[PDB]
Amino acid sequence: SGGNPLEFLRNQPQFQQMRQIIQQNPSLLPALLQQIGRENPQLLQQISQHQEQFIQMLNEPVQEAGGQGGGG
């Protein structure tokens, strides 16, 4: 996928959803932050340590859509 820690998420379809909501509603960022912990506590550790790298992942264009109506 790449080299950066959270950069591997670029291929992870589960994370693709996390970024989708952020494309339209970045306010759901803190909602997904805790969510990462319920699905991948190990990943969350990397998220909190390298948030800056994870944030940019959220903001990149994702093949899903980038809009949500009830997610987070």
UniProtKB/Swiss-Prot annotation:
Q: What is the organism field in this record?
A: Homo sapiens (Human)
Function text: Multiubiquitin chain receptor involved in modulation of proteasomal degradation. Binds to polyubiquitin chains. Proposed to be capable to bind simultaneously to the 26S proteasome and to polyubiquitinated substrates and to deliver ubiquitinated proteins to the proteasome. May play a role in endoplasmic reticulum-associated degradation (ERAD) of misfolded glycoproteins by association with PNGase and delivering deglycosylated proteins to the proteasome. Involved in global genome nucleotide excision repair (GG-NER) by acting as component of the XPC complex. Cooperatively with CETN2 appears to stabilize XPC. May protect XPC from proteasomal degradation.
Q: What is known of its domains?
A: The ubiquitin-like domain mediates interaction with ATXN3.
Listed under subunit, the entry gives: Component of the XPC complex composed of XPC, RAD23B and CETN2. Interacts with NGLY1 and PSMC1. Interacts with ATXN3. Interacts with PSMD4 and PSMC5. Interacts with AMFR. Interacts with VCP; the interaction is indirect and mediated by NGLY1.
The name of this protein is: UV excision repair protein RAD23 homolog B
Endpoints of the signal sequence: none
Q: Which domain of life is it from?
A: Eukaryota
Q: Where in the cell is it found?
A: Nucleus; Cytoplasm
Q: Which residues of the full protein are shown?
A: 271 to 342 of 409
Please state which protein family the record places this protein in.
Answer: Belongs to the RAD23 family.
Gene name, please?
Answer: RAD23B
Start and end of every STI1 domain? 4-47
